[PDB]
Amino acid sequence: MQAIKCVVVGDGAVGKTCLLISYTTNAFPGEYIPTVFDNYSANVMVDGKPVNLGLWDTAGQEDYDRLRPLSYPQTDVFLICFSLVSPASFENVRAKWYPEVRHHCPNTPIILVGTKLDLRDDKDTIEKLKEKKLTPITYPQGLAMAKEIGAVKYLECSALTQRGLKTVFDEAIRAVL
Amino acid sequence: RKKEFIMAELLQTEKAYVRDLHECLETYLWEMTSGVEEIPPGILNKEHIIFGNIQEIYDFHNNIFLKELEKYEQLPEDVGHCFVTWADKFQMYVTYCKNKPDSNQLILEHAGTFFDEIQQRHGLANSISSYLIKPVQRVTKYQLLLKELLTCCEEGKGELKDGLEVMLSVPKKANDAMH
Ligand SMILES: COCc1cccc(NC(=O)Nc2cc(C)on2)c1
């Protein structure tokens, strides 16, 4: 039964940990966002094929450029994440995540994931960005980033609402089969 | 409320880390050192490279750090001092991190499916590689928990800043030690 190592990378502002928790519990954690998501595996069926999906978080390693790649070898698929309401996290896909992921894993597939989709229509978020001469990242911007980095898919999701979330990991699995 | 959730997570995750290391030592390690199974000549007597100092890391957590973290359960705002008291012990993560690339290449190039067979036999969800990343994960995680406590503990929170200092310095020092 095919085993899949999926590593989740990106800035602290993507909410990597919450993404994973929301995915694996089927719920935004709400009351308290845990800081720890331990390496995880579960069976999922995809296009009729059962698959053992492995998920590794990397939160905490954002400042340790030599430690991060300790997790990269033998990964089957990466999620390179950014928050749709942090332009700096989006830019770091280009500046930081893609280069190291590719350097260490040249032939491994990348899914480009925009998180925090629910905060992109939110007045308070939007106004906070307007005050810094910025806007949320929109759909064509992620598409153009995906293309620039060789990402097999660009996908947007919210862990709050679950919108697009299960699709993220479906598609990480389809990128390997 | 929030400082309590964080403290609870600290402790729960510490127990799981101790359990995880223990399982790694008693399954993947023990099968090499036992003399129960046939070792690939690629890795024979190379358990020091594979596992690095994970034994000594486990004994720190299992003999000292967990019991002391537990003593701070009702004192979340003081828990930074635990990291200061035991700062020297954390220097062993520096050694662990340095060895981790050599560990991983050895397992790839020379272990074949020794560890995979051992995983199936014991029915473990975690592969040897998943266990051996855990120390790297754990050591970069304490600083996230301390930062969380700082967002919700009062002026009596220099007993967190000093802890965090130490827990920012250890992973940076291990980071800076890498070839
Ligand atoms: C008015 O909105 C309040 C509010 C408060 C806290 C969280 C959210 N939304 C998310 O966290 N969305 C996420 C989180 C991750 C990770 O991905 N999508 C929204």
Side-chain angles (χ1 to χ4, degrees), chain A residues 1-30 32-44 46-48 50-122 124-127 129 131 134-165 167-177, chain B residues 1-2 4 6-37 39-45 47-66 68-97 99-116 118-119 121-153 156 158-160 162-164 166-171 173-178:
Chain A
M1 193 239 209
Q2 198 194 11
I4 293 159
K5 180 172 170 191
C6 170
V7 180
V8 176
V9 318
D11 285 10
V14 338
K16 287 184 287 303
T17 305
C18 186
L19 194 80
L20 286 161
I21 283 174
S22 177
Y23 177 59
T24 51
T25 64
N26 310 294
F28 188 74
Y32 166 62
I33 303 172
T35 79
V36 178
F37 175 87
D38 276 324
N39 300 356
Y40 169 87
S41 49
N43 295 336
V44 293
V46 177
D47 308 332
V51 142
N52 186 253
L53 179 66
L55 298 170
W56 293 21
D57 194 358
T58 56
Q61 314 168 28
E62 290 90 350
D63 299 337
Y64 306 114
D65 69 327
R66 303 193 193 162
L67 301 181
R68 288 189 303 271
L70 297 181
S71 303
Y72 295 171
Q74 295 71 63
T75 303
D76 300 304
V77 59
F78 286 94
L79 305 187
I80 303 191
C81 307
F82 69 93
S83 154
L84 291 161
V85 295
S86 165
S89 78
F90 179 71
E91 182 50 43
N92 288 329
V93 167
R94 187 150 56 206
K96 186 177 176 175
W97 304 110
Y98 170 60
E100 71 178 44
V101 162
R102 261 303 160 259
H103 183 223
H104 289 99
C105 300
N107 318 326
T108 298
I110 299 162
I111 309 238
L112 184 51
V113 188
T115 63
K116 308 187 175 177
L117 196 252
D118 64 290
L119 283 158
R120 177 152 106 211
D121 310 306
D122 175 76
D124 287 6
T125 310
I126 287 171
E127 171 61 45
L129 294 164
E131 295 161 15
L134 305 162
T135 46
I137 305 290
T138 68
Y139 194 74
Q141 295 185 270
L143 285 180
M145 185 74 282
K147 260 205 80 199
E148 194 185 328
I149 73 190
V152 310
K153 292 283 164 174
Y154 164 63
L155 297 170
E156 292 181 340
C157 67
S158 152
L160 190 315
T161 58
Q162 308 262 324
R163 221 149 83 92
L165 185 64
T167 295
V168 171
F169 295 96
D170 271 9
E171 291 292 339
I173 285 166
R174 289 170 182 145
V176 172
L177 303 187
Chain B
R1 205 43 276 214
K2 201 162 97 131
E4 293 116 305
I6 300 147
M7 187 56 39
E9 196 188 1
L10 185 48
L11 296 180
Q12 165 158 138
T13 60
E14 181 80 6
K15 293 166 193 192
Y17 182 61
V18 178
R19 282 173 194 265
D20 286 338
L21 300 187
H22 172 74
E23 193 81 53
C24 183
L25 295 163
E26 304 297 342
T27 53
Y28 298 118
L29 182 53
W30 182 80
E31 291 276 353
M32 286 191 73
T33 64
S34 248
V36 179
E37 199 68 285
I39 308 160
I43 62 183
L44 183 59
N45 305 8
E47 58 271 77
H48 185 36
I49 310 297
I50 294 190
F51 292 91
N53 63 333
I54 196 164
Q55 186 66 57
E56 282 70 49
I57 293 174
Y58 165 77
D59 297 332
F60 168 47
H61 289 279
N62 179 58
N63 299 336
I64 294 162
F65 205 64
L66 173 59
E68 295 299 300
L69 276 178
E70 295 251 39
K71 289 168 182 187
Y72 283 104
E73 183 179 33
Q74 308 308 321
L75 291 163
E77 57 279 326
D78 296 312
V79 73
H81 200 105
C82 205
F83 296 93
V84 195
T85 297
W86 296 106
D88 283 337
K89 299 286 198 173
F90 283 101
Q91 293 297 310
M92 56 199 133
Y93 287 82
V94 175
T95 312
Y96 188 78
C97 289
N99 182 69
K100 177 70 173 75
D102 295 324
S103 171
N104 188 73
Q105 195 180 46
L106 186 50
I107 299 151
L108 290 164
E109 279 190 72
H110 293 129
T113 86
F114 177 87
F115 297 120
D116 297 350
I118 289 149
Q119 182 178 354
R121 209 184 339 294
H122 296 77
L124 299 166
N126 287 300
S127 67
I128 193 174
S129 293
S130 187
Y131 282 113
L132 299 171
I133 206 66
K134 291 184 179 283
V136 180
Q137 287 172 345
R138 186 68 177 158
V139 76
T140 57
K141 225 82 103 164
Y142 291 120
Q143 61 88 11
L144 292 181
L145 300 156
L146 292 163
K147 292 169 162 158
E148 286 318 283
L149 293 161
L150 279 177
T151 72
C152 68
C153 287
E159 287 283 68
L160 287 165
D162 297 311
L164 169 60
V166 174
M167 301 317 288
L168 287 165
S169 172
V170 171
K173 175 159 189 210
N175 183 260
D176 288 335
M178 306 292 292

